[PDB]
Write a protein that binds this ligand. Structure first.
Ligand SMILES: [Mg+2]
Ligand SMILES: [Mg+2]
Ligand SMILES: [Mg+2]
Ligand SMILES: [Mg+2]
Ligand SMILES: [Mg+2]
Ligand SMILES: [Mg+2]
Ligand SMILES: [Mg+2]
Ligand SMILES: [Mg+2]
Ligand SMILES: [Mg+2]
Ligand SMILES: [Mg+2]
Ligand SMILES: [Mg+2]
Ligand SMILES: [Mg+2]
Ligand SMILES: [Mg+2]
Ligand SMILES: [Mg+2]
Ligand SMILES: [Mg+2]
Ligand SMILES: [Mg+2]
Ligand SMILES: [Mg+2]
Ligand SMILES: [Mg+2]
Ligand SMILES: [Mg+2]
Ligand SMILES: [Mg+2]
Ligand SMILES: [Mg+2]
Ligand SMILES: [Mg+2]
Ligand SMILES: [Mg+2]
Ligand SMILES: [Zn+2]
Ligand SMILES: [Zn+2]
Lengths: 79, 192, 48, 136, 126, 182, 49
RNA sequence: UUUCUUGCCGGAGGUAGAGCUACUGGAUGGCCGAUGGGCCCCACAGGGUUACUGACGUCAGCCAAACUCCGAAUGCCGGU
RNA sequence: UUGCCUCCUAAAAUGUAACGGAGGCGCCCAAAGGUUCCCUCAACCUGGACGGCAAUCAGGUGUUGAGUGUAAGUGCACAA
């Protein structure tokens, strides 16, 4: 007459936060995730909870490097 | 034993798509594609009625003589996409072929004759792969059952294969297995 | 070859009972052995 | 009755019962078969009745292949109860059938007896089916 | 015919060396201003390249197969120090004084350490 | 200035023997022995942790090197065996200690068998890595008899560069190993 | 408690700088580690209070 | 005009579909044939005979919200 | 039943309800934290006294099927 379940946790709002070709500031976090689904690419660092962030200003762009999806920051030219 | 190619007419599909295919299929026509070493996938509508008629007369595996706008080509049926329910042929695949050309194919195997009465004959593989020329392709080949002894297996390696044709399947593929007819106290004992 | 952890190992003189002389090395602190049945004594070794 | 020995999850959603059978639409084991024409939930009750019907009709020697398996459980909450208090306990088993899928297949010497046993089976099913032969 | 069945020590040495090299490489790399000083070593010779990994190019290089280095009657450490000073001079000519040391998957020491310290004293800060 | 004798006789006559009766294209294909491994698999020390002490002592005296203690890298319910428990002791011998131990075994200890009837020629693992056991540590004269406490068997493995049992057996016989003649 | 809260104090100035936890079943004695003392200005031993 | 629409461009997905010898589970019928089953000569050695049960494997056809070797349309983020 | 965490529902961004479907948490580890270096498992075949498929030894096959304190998911063999 009772359900032995009915509990869940809060949604953590994970996922890609900046997509390809998007200009970011240095320090912006770019994708929140659990494991390493996206590996840190060139000029992109990885946080303690596996959060990828940008170590330099530029444009986001994804890639594959030896069978590993990677995220990179590309230096846009100064006008 | 050369098999005479069957003469169909075809004409190049003006424009492609699911709408075009549905319309053509609605006008009693089959969309098909030529390919092979002709290196040109050529999109051809052909008469549905004549296609079905020649497939009845000479099975799935039969050479055709396609008349493409006057040009004359030899073709061989590679595959037929058929609806599971309405059973109409939807699409056809046509390798281009010429004389003296070995080609791999799958030929139906129809058990012929009556068996010994106390047991039933049952085929596991109805089709056997053979390597054979374009014209010399057998539409069907038979396997012998004439009062077998008690239950025994038959494989592709002991079939009377035609001349000019070569077995492709591994010889130890079972085709027809005579299995003892279930008794009264054995038939309803399986299935639950 | 560690410093001293292994057991003592020196050259040893081994003499058979039937007259064979073996020039060997073992861990015998003495370094001297005499054996009465050897490779030339057993019936299986030399067929006797 | 046909019951799976275990299912990873014992309370699933109702099987989506749309589309045409893509897999399992040909007669391969025996020579004659029963091939479906409507979406339904063929329970193991229907399958057992149909199989016994075929066996009763042929009754001598011939192979019946039930190439569908009832392994999807439909639950039912106990009677006289209101809505709520969670999902019920599973208490019948089902195969999800699409129009196109050969349900039963038969191997038997003659023609008419085989056809009659197949239609005897068909009458026990909640759908329209048709007898289909080993050839195009 | 005599088909061999085992694995040879050459294979294990070569690929274990490559694995150690790659593990190392996960953490060092070469730019134009701070290139990478990668080292090979064999039973006869020691080799060095000065790499800009942004391109996969080599900026300077040396080995113990040159005329002068083969002119030394000394020890393998002597060849190592000669190679170190030569590659330091070639790097300084190329316009660079900072570098990262890629030891190449060999343990740091022996002749590799001699080479590295020769380059260190010779003008290359690493 | 000094070499083991049995290695000397090996190089001197066994190399030509193996070459001339196995006919290798490359003189380096002429096989040889590579290593030996002595393992006392104690195992029952799951309760008596003190028996491995005599194990390692007697194995050290016979082999000349101190065994690494081999623990158990699995947890199993039956044998009262937990992960990380010392179960066996092994020493590998290569080079001069190699040859000298082979001397101490085959010229001395293996004769000391009571009821000796040879060692089976079918004792190879498909490629000529010959491994045999026994059940008494008292065939080694490095240990006195009464000084023992329990009857223990070793585990003697000779690992060679044979391609198959033919090279392995030809080598072991050429080294002077009294097999069983089946 | 078995993993209680503990405090660490510098020996040379007796200021309580850090609070941590440790198991009393496994670390019965006072825990001492070289920590950083903000007013001593350098790393000093710190002992459990 | 930053809004919104349409075209083009740069993205990240795991849904519909499909597939499963690509995993985790279910699951149909064959095939060979164990180990373990029984018996003979007669030992509880050893050997073979036998509805054996028939590991594994393999052939063909399948199934899944919490399966995925795969995999859209739309929507979404940005630019133009 | 009431707070937290993980998955499916949840319709490929995020978010998404029900007395919907399944489980965990209220800790633990002074190393199970930091760094430096080194290594590759599980399973399977073959050869070995106890020792049996199974315990430790040796040879081979083995790219991930093992393991990751602890649920589940995302990860990790470049190794976490
Ligand atoms: Mg969640
Ligand atoms: Mg961290
Ligand atoms: Mg943390
Ligand atoms: Mg749906
Ligand atoms: Mg189908
Ligand atoms: Mg499918
Ligand atoms: Mg009906
Ligand atoms: Mg080997
Ligand atoms: Mg402690
Ligand atoms: Mg736009
Ligand atoms: Mg786009
Ligand atoms: Mg994409
Ligand atoms: Mg998902
Ligand atoms: Mg689906
Ligand atoms: Mg499952
Ligand atoms: Mg899905
Ligand atoms: Mg979503
Ligand atoms: Mg959506
Ligand atoms: Mg809502
Ligand atoms: Mg709870
Ligand atoms: Mg750790
Ligand atoms: Mg540490
Ligand atoms: Mg191994
Ligand atoms: Zn003697
Ligand atoms: Zn202080």
């Amino acid at each position: 007459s009772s359900s032995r379940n009915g509990r869940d946790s809060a949604a953590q709002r994970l996922g890609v936060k900046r997509f390809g070709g998007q200009v970011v500031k240095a320090g912006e976090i770019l994708v929140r995730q659990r494991g390493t689904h996206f590996h840190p690419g060139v000029n992109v660092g990885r946080g303690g909870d596996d959060t990828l962030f940008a170590l330099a200003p530029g444009a986001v762009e994804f890639g594959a490097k030896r069978g590993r999806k990677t995220v990179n920051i590309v230096p846009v030219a100064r006008p | 034993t050369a098999n005479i190619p069957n003469k169909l007419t075809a004409n190049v599909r003006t424009r492609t798509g699911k709408g075009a295919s549905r319309q053509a299929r609605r006008d009693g026509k089959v969309p098909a594609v030529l390919y092979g070493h002709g290196t040109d996938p050529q999109h051809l509508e052909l008469n549905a009625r004549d296609f079905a008629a020649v497939l009845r007369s000479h099975g799935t595996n039969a050479i055709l003589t396609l008349d493409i706008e006057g040009t004359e080509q030899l073709a061989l049926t590679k595959a037929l996409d058929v609806h599971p329910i309405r059973r109409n042929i939807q699409h056809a695949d046509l390798l281009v072929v010429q004389r003296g050309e070995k080609v791999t194919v799958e030929v139906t195997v129809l058990v012929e004759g009556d068996a010994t009465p106390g047991t039933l004959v049952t085929q596991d593989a109805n089709t056997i792969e053979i390597e054979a020329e374009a014209l010399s392709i057998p539409e069907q080949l038979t396997v012998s059952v004439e009062g077998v002894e008690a239950g025994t297996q038959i494989t592709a390696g002991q079939i009377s294969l035609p001349e000019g044709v070569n077995l492709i399947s591994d010889p130890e593929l079972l085709v027809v297995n005579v299995v003892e007819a279930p008794s009264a106290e054995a038939l309803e004992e399986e299935g639950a | 070859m560690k410093t001293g952890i292994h057991p003592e190992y020196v050259d040893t003189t081994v003499q058979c009972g039937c007259g064979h002389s073996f020039t060997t090395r073992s861990t015998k602190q003495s370094g001297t052995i005499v054996v009465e049945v050897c490779s030339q004594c057993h019936p299986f070794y030399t067929g006797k | 009755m046909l019951i799976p020995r275990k299912v990873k999850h014992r309370k699933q959603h109702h099987p989506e019962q749309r589309g045409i059978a893509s897999g399992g639409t040909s007669v391969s084991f025996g020579d004659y078969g029963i091939q479906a024409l409507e979406h339904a939930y063929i329970t193991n009750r229907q399958i057992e009745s149909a199989r016994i019907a075929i066996n009763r009709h042929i009754k001598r020697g011939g192979k019946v292949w039930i190439n569908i398996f009832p392994d999807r459980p439909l639950t039912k909450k106990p009677a006289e109860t209101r809505m709520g208090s969670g999902k019920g306990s599973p208490e019948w088993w089902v195969a999800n059938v699409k129009p196109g899928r050969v349900l039963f297949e038969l191997s038997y010497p003659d023609e008419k007896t085989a056809r009659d046993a197949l239609t005897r089976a068909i009458h026990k099913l909640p759908i329209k089916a048709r007898i289909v032969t080993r050839e195009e | 015919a005599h088909k061999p069945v085992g694995q040879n020590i050459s294979e294990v040495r070569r690929n274990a060396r490559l694995r150690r090299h790659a593990r190392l490489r996960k953490k060092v790399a070469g730019t134009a201003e701070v290139p990478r000083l990668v080292v090979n070593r064999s039973a006869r010779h020691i080799h060095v390249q000065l790499v800009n990994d942004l391109n996969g190019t080599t900026l300077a290089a040396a080995s113990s197969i040159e005329a002068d280095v083969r002119a030394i009657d000394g020890d393998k450490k002597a060849h190592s120090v000669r190679v170190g000073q030569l590659i330091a001079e070639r790097a300084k000519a190329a316009g660079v004084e900072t570098v990262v040391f890629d030891r190449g998957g060999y343990t740091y020491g022996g002749r590799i350490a001699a080479l590295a310290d020769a380059a260190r004293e010779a003008g290359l800060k690493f | 200035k000094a070499l083991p004798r049995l290695k000397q006789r090996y190089r001197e006559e066994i190399r030509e023997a193996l070459q001339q009766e196995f006919n290798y294209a490359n003189v380096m294909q002429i096989p040889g022995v590579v290593k030996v491994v002595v393992n006392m698999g104690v195992g029952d020390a799951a309760r008596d942790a003190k028996l491995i002490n005599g194990a390692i002592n007697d194995l050290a005296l016979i082999t000349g090197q101190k065994p690494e203690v081999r623990r158990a890298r699995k947890s199993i319910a039956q044998f009262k065996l937990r992960e990380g428990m010392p179960i066996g002791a092994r020493v590998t011998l290569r080079g001069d200690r190699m040859w000298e131990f082979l001397d101490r075994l085959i010229s001395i200890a293996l004769p000391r068998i009571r009821d000796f009837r040879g060692l089976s020629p079918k004792q190879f693992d498909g490629t000529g890595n010959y491994t045999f056991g026994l059940n008494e540590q008292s065939m080694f004269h490095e240990i006195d008899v009464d000084s023992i406490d329990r009857p223990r068997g070793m585990d003697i493995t000779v690992v060679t560069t044979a391609t198959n049992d033919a090279e392995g057996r030809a080598l072991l016989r050429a080294l002077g190993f009294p097999f069983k003649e089946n | 408690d078995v993993r209680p809260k503990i405090t660490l104090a510098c020996e040379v100035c007796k200021h309580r700088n850090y609070i941590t936890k440790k198991n009393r079943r496994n670390d019965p004695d006072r825990l001492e580690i070289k920590k950083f003392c903000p007013n001593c200005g350098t790393h000093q031993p710190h002992k459990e209070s």
